Amino acid sequence: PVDYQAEDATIVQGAVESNHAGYTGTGFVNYDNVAGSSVEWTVTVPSAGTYDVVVRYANGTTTSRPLDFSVNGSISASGVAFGSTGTWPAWTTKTVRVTLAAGVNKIKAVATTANGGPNVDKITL
């Protein structure tokens, strides 16, 4: 049951920020508000199979901000909606099923809409 901080991951069109309370680690990733913004985590698991990946995020708007999840090149979850949390400090979790190989994997979450992604604190699996 391991935490992988977003601010420690590979960030494309985003910024490590810390101005909303409740994040874990040293901060969170604020996705740029464009399609294509992404965070990519390097994770390690002991066995091949499908893992529950718990995404901790916030969305202080009324519009869902969908992400596509992929593992080392291949789609894992398409159009996962990240709906309102009301305020930016009100972190919530959503579980996404991802199939992994034994050992090291990269899990990428890319924003598919012009609003970019929710703010993302971490994933846990």
Residue 5 in contact with Ca ion, rule: CB under 5 A: yes
The least distance separating ligand GCU from the CB of residue 6, rounded to whole angstroms, comes to: 12
Q: How far apart are CA 11 and CA 20, in angstroms?
A: 19
Interface region with Ca ion, contact rule CB under 5 A, candidates 4-12, 40-48, 82-90, 106-114:
4-12
Phi/psi region, residue 112 (left: phi>0; alpha: psi -120 to 50; beta: rest), is alpha
Residue 118 corresponds to which tokens in the numbers above?
């929710």
Residue 25 in contact with Ca ion, rule: CB under 5 A: yes
CB 53 within 8 A of CB 105: no
Residues near ligand GCU, by CB under 6 A: 20, 30, 33, 61, 88, 116, 119
Which residues form the interface with Ca ion (CB under 5 A)?
A: 5, 23-25, 28, 30-31, 33, 116, 121-122
